[PDB]
From Swiss-Prot, chain A:
One BP annotation, GO: mitochondrial translation
Name of the protein described by the UniProt record: Large ribosomal subunit protein mL44
GO molecular-function terms, A-Z: double-stranded RNA binding; ribonuclease III activity; structural constituent of ribosome
Entry keyword set: Mitochondrion, Ribonucleoprotein, Ribosomal protein, RNA-binding, Transit peptide
Source organism, top-level taxon: Eukaryota
Gene: MRPL3
Annotated ranges, domain RNase III: 73-139
Description of how the protein assembles with itself and partners: Component of the mitochondrial large ribosomal subunit (mt-LSU). Mature yeast 74S mitochondrial ribosomes consist of a small (37S) and a large (54S) subunit. The 37S small subunit contains a 15S ribosomal RNA (15S mt-rRNA) and 34 different proteins. The 54S large subunit contains a 21S rRNA (21S mt-rRNA) and 46 different proteins. mL44 forms a heterodimer with mL57 and stabilizes rRNA expansion segments 1/2 at a membrane-facing protuberance close to the point of attachment of the ribosome to the translocon in the membrane.
Main location (coarse class): mitochondrion
Family: Belongs to the ribonuclease III family. Mitochondrion-specific ribosomal protein mL44 subfamily.
Signal sequence segment: none
Curated annotation (Swiss-Prot), chain B:
Full-protein positions shown: 213 to 264 of 264
Lineage: Eukaryota, Fungi, Dikarya, Ascomycota, Saccharomycotina
Cellular compartments annotated: Mitochondrion
Protein name stated in the entry: Large ribosomal subunit protein mL50
Species the sequence originates in: Saccharomyces cerevisiae (strain ATCC 204508 / S288c)
Family to which the UniProt record says this protein belongs: Belongs to the mitochondrion-specific ribosomal protein mL50 family.
Subunit architecture: Component of the mitochondrial large ribosomal subunit (mt-LSU). Mature yeast 74S mitochondrial ribosomes consist of a small (37S) and a large (54S) subunit. The 37S small subunit contains a 15S ribosomal RNA (15S mt-rRNA) and 34 different proteins. The 54S large subunit contains a 21S rRNA (21S mt-rRNA) and 46 different proteins.
UniProtKB/Swiss-Prot annotation, chain C:
Single GO MF descriptor: structural constituent of ribosome
Subunit structure, as described in the record: Component of the mitochondrial large ribosomal subunit (mt-LSU). Mature yeast 74S mitochondrial ribosomes consist of a small (37S) and a large (54S) subunit. The 37S small subunit contains a 15S ribosomal RNA (15S mt-rRNA) and 34 different proteins. The 54S large subunit contains a 21S rRNA (21S mt-rRNA) and 46 different proteins.
Protein name, entry field: Large ribosomal subunit protein mL43
UniProt subcellular location: Mitochondrion
Main location (coarse class): mitochondrion
One Pfam match: L51_S25_CI-B8
Note: Present with 3400 molecules/cell in log phase SD medium.
UniProtKB/Swiss-Prot annotation, chain F:
Family, similarity comment: Belongs to the universal ribosomal protein uL22 family.
Protein's name according to its UniProt entry: Large ribosomal subunit protein uL22m
GO molecular function terms listed in the Swiss-Prot or TrEMBL record: structural constituent of ribosome
Organism the protein comes from: Saccharomyces cerevisiae (strain ATCC 204508 / S288c) (Baker's yeast)
Assembly and interaction partners: Component of the mitochondrial large ribosomal subunit (mt-LSU). Mature yeast 74S mitochondrial ribosomes consist of a small (37S) and a large (54S) subunit. The 37S small subunit contains a 15S ribosomal RNA (15S mt-rRNA) and 34 different proteins. The 54S large subunit contains a 21S rRNA (21S mt-rRNA) and 46 different proteins. uL22m forms the wall of the exit tunnel.
Comment field (misc): Present with 1800 molecules/cell in log phase SD medium.
Shown residues in whole-protein numbering: 142 to 309 of 309
Cited function: Component of the mitochondrial ribosome (mitoribosome), a dedicated translation machinery responsible for the synthesis of mitochondrial genome-encoded proteins, including at least some of the essential transmembrane subunits of the mitochondrial respiratory chain. The mitoribosomes are attached to the mitochondrial inner membrane and translation products are cotranslationally integrated into the membrane.
A single cellular component GO annotation: mitochondrion
Coiled-coil stretches noted in the UniProt entry, renumbered to this chain: none
Amino acid sequence: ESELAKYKEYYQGLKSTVNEIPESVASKSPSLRTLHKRLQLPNELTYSTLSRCLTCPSAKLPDKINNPTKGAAFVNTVPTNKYLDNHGLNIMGKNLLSYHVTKSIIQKYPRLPTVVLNAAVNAYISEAVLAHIAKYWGIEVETTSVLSRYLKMEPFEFTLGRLKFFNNSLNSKDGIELITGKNFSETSALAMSVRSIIAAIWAVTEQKDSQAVYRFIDDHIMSRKLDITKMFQFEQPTRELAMLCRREGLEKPVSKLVAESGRLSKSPVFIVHVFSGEETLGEGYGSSLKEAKARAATDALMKWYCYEPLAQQEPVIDPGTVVV
Amino acid sequence: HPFSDNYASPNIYVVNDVTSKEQKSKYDTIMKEIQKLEDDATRKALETARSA
Amino acid sequence: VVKAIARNSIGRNGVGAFVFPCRKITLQFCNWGGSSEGMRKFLTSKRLDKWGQEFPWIQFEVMRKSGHPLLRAEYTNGREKVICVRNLNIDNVENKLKLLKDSDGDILRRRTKNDNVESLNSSVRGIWSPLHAAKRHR
Amino acid sequence: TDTTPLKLSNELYAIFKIHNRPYLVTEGDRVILPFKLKQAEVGDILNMTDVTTLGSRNYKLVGHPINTSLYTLKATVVGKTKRAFQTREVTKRRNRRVRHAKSKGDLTILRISELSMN
Amino acid sequence: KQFGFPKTQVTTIYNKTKSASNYKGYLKHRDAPGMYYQPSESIATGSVNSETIPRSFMAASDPRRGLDMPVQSTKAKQCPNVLVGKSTVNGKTYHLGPQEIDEIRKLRLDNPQKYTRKFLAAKYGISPLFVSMVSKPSEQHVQIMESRLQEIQSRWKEKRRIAREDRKRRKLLWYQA
Amino acid sequence: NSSERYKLKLTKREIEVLEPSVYAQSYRIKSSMKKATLLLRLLGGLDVMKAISQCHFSNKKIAREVAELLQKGVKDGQKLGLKPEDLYISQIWTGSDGFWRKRVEFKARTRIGIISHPYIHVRCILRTKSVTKRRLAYEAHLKEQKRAPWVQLGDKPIRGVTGGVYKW
RNA sequence: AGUAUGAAAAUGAUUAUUUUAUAAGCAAUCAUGAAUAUAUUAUAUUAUAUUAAUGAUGUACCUUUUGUAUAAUGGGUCAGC
RNA sequence: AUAAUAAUAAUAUGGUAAUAGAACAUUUAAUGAUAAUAUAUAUUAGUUAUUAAUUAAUAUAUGUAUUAAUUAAAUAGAGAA
């Protein structure tokens, strides 16, 4: 006999299992099972599907393997099947995230500016955030080599359970990164995995319970804290407020001193209110008068934009951003 | 001498007791075998070049 | 004119869907080594199976090493508790395992008096202001 | 009890009491009880009962444990744990015996998942 | 007044003037069970709260419009105008025709040092801002002005530059909310 | 001659060490450490040439030795590739050189002391004005940029614990 | 008074961070800003760490004593014994 | 009828001289797997109700534990002369 032959046949078996993701093997994988139990995924979502979601596309081994001298070696993963990876799933998950999150944000804040809305959406479902979520869930990367695994003589089940992409061995050894594309990044792979899981959930539940996916998203993605007030940065807000007042049936906004203390000091306090008629729109405190005025305008704009109506109200469609 | 089958609850498992020394020996044999294979192929290529 | 500030969301584990903090536990023992007796007994005696049945979201690795017996947990936040269970009986080991599973992974920390609630949320009522107080000072 | 303004308001706080210890909370807030919970395991949900005060920005429905029906307040038990281990030393002023008073109190991290007017 | 709830201060059992920070007194103070009106002791600057938003910014079908919580405590008659433009005090005027504008533009290009914005404003009974909006100066003049500004900046000490930076940071912070 | 991009990840210590420097060392100088310090504190962050000049016109005995050391460090820097008008003394310290021979001082009325005879060494690290100084200027600039301003009516944390109750 | 090896301490100099020129005591603890450092789940409004803003409280140890901050006693300091 | 751990109730749980109980560190002897993917040692950061041990990172050695554990021996633990 020969040990090379033994290793080779093991590798071949592993490749075959990757191509298939046979259901029994996937079931045997403890990590997959624990992930399934942790997230409370549907029973219709098979363990093979979950394994596939963790399998990123990796058809051909790249040219950068040829030289570890240039700071890269791809020796962990094994080639995947063209029609059994997380790629199609991932796209679907991304689409779902882009639809649902955005919709939820619009429901919450129907006048939110377009740029601000986009930023909020990004915050909710940015690649880094998605990667973090995946890490939290316990989607671990297949860092160990194939040869090493063979030597240990571990089953293929464990491999199936881990996340599988062209992860560069010696990525940041001796403090040297190679700056490769998105197809070799860990964060991206983790993002794909979390999107792929969502897509798989959708696939299994859509006919029985159409909104199951969206309630899962709400539980995991939309449950996260984001203060929308911290997102804004105005420029000349008084002018913008005046424009807004003009657009609506409101009197011209003027700022007026409500209260004042410590004028002729290092740190005064000036309270000014931007009135439109007798109604106050924005209240603004400040060290200077100018500052206070600015703050009142910004407050007014916040109140305009971040207005969140009740669920009992009929839908509020805003009349666009205030084009100054 | 526990095993993964012994526990009968699929989230439990026992990692394989392969001695470090044995693994090292296996590695040595495989890389050596590869080297042997390569060297013979190179020799053959040299012989072919010499011929024509 | 209005411009966004790029900002990211904060995950509150409990509010939507509770992800269980403990993700993996490794039982480590030695075949030699008299300190690993209680661990060995625990591994043998049908308790581990019951545990796994109870908690199918945790994976239970079982490893053999030359040193003292070890219980290393692994949590959602990425931290790792490792309890050495040297010379402990079966029941003590089980209690230790229970303690580990109970833990949210976060580091241990001194709390001051009444440092109870930890909010991301802005106050529902505002922050106090002397100009806006109900009773004016003198 | 006309509880309409509270119901309307987007922001809302509660001052529920566990063993007469008040904890002022909103949804998402992460309460840290200074004892070991025996009844609830990790993952279990706690329906708060002795709720003293339920407040908006300008109103509050406060009094004896307000009717639970009026509201909901679900906490989730998100990890039993402990405080950091401390060892203060106890000794008298011309005495070489120095007794170490070791301490490592228990904690229970709750998370306020739901808080709303029913 | 829609609601006729009794109103309460944030009451301590202790002397509030001497022990406002003492949480214990607040904890002690029990009040009879029911609904109350505790007006907030706060400015409504950073708040997105629904009790803080004005009625004009609420939607027409909002139930909250009718409820009396965006309280108009202040009065615009009593408050005096702060950093208000002369257009806002005495109304906007749209009097200058195209010919006048063209003349202004011609003047400004010709000699911005002689025919400065303020002078133009004085001549035509209109704002310096409006003059600026109407007409660009000769780009040379602008360049000169930029160079002068740069020279002034260079003339500063280290401390002054730092102070200016701090001021700029503060200004940026104002518009955050 | 390549299309491979890279990003380098280096610790603070690694950054410090890799900047071009030169490490002068004296021989076994006959002096006290205190006496050396009394001079060496003057030659803190000077340009090497300035320091050498100061040593030349110093009244002290260690001064000549210090000057010689500086000259040697300059020569070393030149040999390496550096310039003498670029070099500044980054660090310069002293230490005991060991094997100080004690020797009893006999006093009046059957009393004694012990006279030690101290030997020291001066080492110094010369770094470049062209790199290290530029780097620390850049760092200072970054720190200045980062620095949050003084806000007059600014958001200071309401220090203290809440106590499960609104005080407002 | 063997031969190596020796990030053992006391102790010297230097630098870096950080604090310090209106503040008065065993020099700490606790409270609490702030600055900085590191962090391969800082998602962060993160964590920890370093640090004499700042406030509270705080009369070295030991022996010997009816009783010690004691101006009763012993110890310069570390390592070995 | 025992033990191990966990429950509910109650009672107690300051302490000099002093009495009793039970542990740990260190060194040697008997028995004795393991292996530089290890061990030993050090710093730091953790975990274990924590004199202790253990995880990880790192430095240094060493192809290796009188090693875990049970006994039995101690020249068995030092801010006090």
